[PDB]
């Protein structure tokens, strides 16, 4: 019944996660930044901040009322945001369904009193953190494309020199 640090996210198939870390190790030396663990690669829909058990339940219920078709993500884009010090993977033209889902979840969080960054939703998958220096970003690998069937509520913790994301609940997207 202690508060947890939560976020909604979309996950990647194992095969694609593996292609990504192989591609990453090939193009980015350790000095380019701190690599996100393969299992920790995800696309965040909405950050909720620290959330009480009571508030988690309310947000989970609102998430469960979402009615949306599934969509396809094709990762054709890669870049670097120096100020936020990340190297990221993303999509040039995200499907509307992704935008709809994120905005819906973000709206629900906001209306519940959740911490607001007032940052415009920029769908991305963080590959490197603490990326300070400016490196050369290659295009992604070929055919990193898959159907999104669901989204998940995660808890975030740190154990044994690792970041850990714990799945709490999942909701399927219709199709
Ligand atoms: Cl371009």
Residue numbers in the entry: 2 to 176
Anything the authors wrote about it?
The structure of the putative tRNA ligase LigT from E. coli was determined by X-ray crystallography in the apo form. Comparisons to the apo form of the enzyme determined in the current work allow the highlighting of conformational changes and binding determinants of the reactive species. Considering reaction geometry, a water molecule coordinated by His125 in the apo structure can now be designated as the nucleophilic water, analogously to CNPase. In a ligand-free active site, also Phe48 is seen to take a conformation distinct from that seen in ligand complexes. Hence, as opposed to CNPase, in which the active site is to a large extent pre-organized for substrate binding, LigT shows more flexibility.
The 2H phosphoesterase superfamily is an ancient group of proteins and protein domains characterized by a common fold and a few conserved active site residues. E. coli LigT is a 20-kDa protein that exhibits 2′,3′-cyclic nucleotide 3′-phosphodiesterase and 2′-5′-ligase/phosphodiesterase activities, but the biological function of the enzyme is unknown. The LigT structure presents a typical 2H phosphoesterase fold, in which the catalytic residues reside at the beginning of strands β2 and β6. As in other 2H family members, the active site has 2-fold symmetry; this symmetry also includes the 4 water molecules at the bottom of the active site, connecting the active-site β strands through water-mediated hydrogen bonds.
